[PDB]
Amino acid sequence: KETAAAKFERQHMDSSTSAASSSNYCNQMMKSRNLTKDRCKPVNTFVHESLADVQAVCSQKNVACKNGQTNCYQSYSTMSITDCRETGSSKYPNCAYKTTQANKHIIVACEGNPYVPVHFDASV
Ligand SMILES: CSC(=S)/C=C(\O)c1cccc(O)c1
Ligand SMILES: [Ru+3]
Numbered sequence: 001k002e003t004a005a006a007k008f009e010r011q012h013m014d015s016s017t018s019a020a021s022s023s024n025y026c027n028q029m030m031k032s033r034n035l036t037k038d039r040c041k042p043v044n045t046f047v048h049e050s051l052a053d054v055q056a057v058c059s060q061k062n063v064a065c066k067n068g069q070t071n072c073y074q075s076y077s078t079m080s081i082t083d084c085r086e087t088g089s090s091k092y093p094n095c096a097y098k099t100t101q102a103n104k105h106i107i108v109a110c111e112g113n114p115y116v117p118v119h120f121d122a123s124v
Contacts, residue, residue: 004111004118011035012120013054014046019080019101026084026097040086040095045120047106048080058110058117065121071109072121078103081123 002010010033020026035041047054057075065072083100090096102123109119 005116008108008117008119009051012045012047012117013051014048014082015050017048019048020046020082020099023099025082026099027095030084030095030097036093036095040090040092042086044084045106045123046082046084047120048082053079054106054108055116057106057108058115063107065107065109065119069109071111072107073110074107074124075105077105079106081106083123 014029029046030036030041030044035044057073059073060076061074062070063072063074064070080103081101083102084097085100087096087098104123106120107122107124108117109121110116111118
């Protein structure tokens, strides 16, 4: 029932803050977005731009996806993001993450009709 498009919004959209509100950000957000459910998701990126701006990336710079598919797109403008990376001492169910804020171009995979983001591939 959760569409792929909806899952992308759950995993990767946080339009509510301009930047990572705190060294705590990742611990709180991975948990509440259900990314520490069955395992600690090792790496995950949140984007702090509007939904419209992030959906519009599917019409921007077409680039190869890390997996070799052709349906990835790089943003022309930089975007405000937060990178969440599991710590060395992190142990499920107490998943712990380092939080890093940045401004970078994002790369997303897009699929469907309508053609919308479904995976976060990379930042550059
Ligand atoms: C690491 S890629 C780099 S930083 C590229 C850009 O900023 C970029 C690329 C194409 C068009 C454009 O207008 C901007
Ligand atoms: Ru650039």
